[PDB]
Design a protein around this ligand. Structure first.
Ligand code: HEM
Length: 152
């Protein structure tokens, strides 16, 4: 549950991401994979990437970064009213991709990390707070659908 003030901050921060969605998406996935190597194993099309340089050079990783952040952005722009958008993601990630909720926590923190890295001094305390709450909301609603499905 975010206030409109907090949503305003979220979408303001998101404007930074949309100015370069591929570059942001790329660094988020790289931060995830290098921070938490077990996550790489969930991607049959990235598990070949043994080094970060290979990750950096991968146009398909950048492409997937775009898909992921485009989806997240569409969800954030709903300001919490995202049941329709979120349910198919929850379902594919529990039933097909088999992504534990822990990894959604991982990528949440990775987003925070990347924003600070790309916008040092331009991602204030209030902005971080709002974005964090937004990602928690996202995660919590996915977690509800996981429980429904009995997925661990
Ligand atoms: C903000 C969080 C995330 C968003 C918005 C997101 C979104 C998406 C979307 C839109 C797709 C393609 C459509 C689909 O299969 O449902 C996808 C595919 C996929 N995602 Fe996620 N995802 C997120 C987090 C994660 C995480 C943390 C992992 C694993 C650590 C993951 C693993 C995968 C895999 C393995 C695929 C299939 C890739 C392929 O084979 O083409 N996702 N994701």
């Amino acid at each position: 549950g975010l206030s409109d003030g907090e949503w305003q901050q979220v979408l303001n921060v998101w404007g930074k991401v949309e100015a370069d969605i591929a570059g942001h998406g790329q660094e988020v996935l790289i931060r995830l994979f290098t921070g938490h190597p077990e996550t790489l194993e969930k991607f049959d099309k990235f598990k070949h990437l043994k080094t970060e340089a290979e990750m950096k050079a991968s146009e398909d990783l950048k492409k997937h970064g775009t898909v992921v952040l485009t989806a997240l952005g569409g969800i954030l722009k709903k300001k919490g009213h995202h049941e329709a958008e979120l349910k198919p993601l929850a379902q594919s990630h529990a039933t097909k991709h088999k992504i534990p909720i822990k990894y959604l926590e991982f990528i949440s923190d990775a987003i925070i990390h990347v924003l600070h890295s790309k916008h040092p001094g331009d991602f204030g305390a209030d902005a971080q707070g709002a974005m964090t709450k937004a990602l928690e909301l996202f995660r919590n609603d996915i977690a509800a659908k996981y429980k429904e499905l009995g997925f661990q």
